[PDB]
Amino acid sequence: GEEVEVHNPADLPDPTRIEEILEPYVKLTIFTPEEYVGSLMQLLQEKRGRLVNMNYLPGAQKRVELVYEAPFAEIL
Amino acid sequence: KKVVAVVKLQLPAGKATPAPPVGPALGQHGANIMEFVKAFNAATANMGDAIVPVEITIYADRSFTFVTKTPPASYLIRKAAGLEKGAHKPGREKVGRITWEQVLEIAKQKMPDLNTTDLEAAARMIAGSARSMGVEVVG
Amino acid sequence: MLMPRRMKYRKQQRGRLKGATKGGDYVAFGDYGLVALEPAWITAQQIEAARVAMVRHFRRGGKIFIRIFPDKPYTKKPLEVRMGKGKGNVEGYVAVVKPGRVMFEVAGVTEEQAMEALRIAGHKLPIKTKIVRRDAYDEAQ
RNA sequence: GCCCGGAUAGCUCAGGGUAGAGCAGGGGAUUGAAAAUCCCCGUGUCCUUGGUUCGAUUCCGAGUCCGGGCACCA
Ligand SMILES: [Mg+2]
Ligand SMILES: [Mg+2]
Ligand SMILES: [Mg+2]
Ligand SMILES: [Mg+2]
Ligand SMILES: [Mg+2]
Ligand SMILES: [Mg+2]
């Protein structure tokens, strides 16, 4: 089954019999103005966030909204 | 109400949903996003699939207008003898092989794109995409 | 790095470094060569560093001809030791190179590749050198 | 850095025509059920990356590293 490598990376279960280590991810939404977007994406890349979605709220003209699934630990 | 940007880009006849670059460039827009899908993946589907871009024009009251063509000479050669890469190490690698007229059909489709309305200069054309994936011209 | 597989004698006297080279003065196997302009005991570690440098430059393609061999053993007393008590121990091998000698040759390689690989390789040796290109004069030899 | 070598399974390891064994495990045999013993079975991206070959753990590079030599190191 499953349980949590708690406040002790040392106190694992035996990585002998192991198949899935799970990070906490998070639904991460970024309201940038204009195409700082270019900067933003490079940042979220090395933070290992998957790009799921982006949407322009037009009007003038900057405003872009980015949605990301990213490992919770990679913020903090 | 976005300006009149001249929309030269590089998209694919099939791979079509609002993941980038469908979004960033077509931000300055307001068009029916799933139309390069719809009309382009359907009306030019006889050839197969693959990459062809699209030339839209945005006008301020959210107006689209686009025309396109033919999957890339490196696709029309992937149906040929069964490839989906090149040959990694060509110049000597003769994986698939074609005849001087089994590579005369492939320009029946990409003919209206170069400047050669002669399917000799349009044969060695698509047969040049051969070498950079290694498929040969027999004897 | 090169050393003889066996020797009649372990230690040998220093000798003089006089004269132009006796032979090996014409490009004999490749298209370009590096020739010595001054005499020297070129050590094996030097030869190895010159070889590798050109190799690295030919990462895909090329033949390297090393036409000098370090057969002369090099002797050195242990440090902080008074004069006497016999001749030092062999601590390495050198090749005696006199001016005019062709030390390295490259083939199978564009002119630019050849004169760049030989230029680096010169920078590894304790002597001034000259890069040369197989001549009718080599063919006549 | 250097000379010798030495990185092959979760671990300790044997070794130019695709490499195994102990071991840990999981399961099984034995038992009333265990311990001990024994059987069975894997993912090896033969340490990483590039090249050499028709064929590389092997050969040529580079990278990081491990055990012994020198050397720096009140
Ligand atoms: Mg010296
Ligand atoms: Mg001496
Ligand atoms: Mg003395
Ligand atoms: Mg001595
Ligand atoms: Mg010099
Ligand atoms: Mg002290």
Side-chain angles (χ1 to χ4, degrees), chain C residues 12-50:
Chain C
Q12 62 170 149
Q13 312 162 342
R14 318 218 179 285
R16 213 98 144 62
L17 273 165
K18 305 203 69 190
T21 193
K22 202 156 59 132
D25 57 324
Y26 54 97
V27 189
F29 302 91
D31 303 329
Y32 304 75
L34 191 63
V35 344
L37 291 184
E38 320 169 284
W41 295 350
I42 278 92
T43 73
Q45 15 276 115
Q46 292 161 6
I47 298 158
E48 173 81 301

Side-chain angles (χ1 to χ4, degrees), chain A residues 11-31:
Chain A
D11 199 358
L12 261 198
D14 200 310
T16 305
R17 63 114 166 207
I18 203 124
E19 221 200 320
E20 299 102 343
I21 336 96
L22 313 161
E23 312 194 62
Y25 262 69
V26 73
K27 167 171 205 159
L28 173 56
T29 335
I30 287 181
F31 297 85

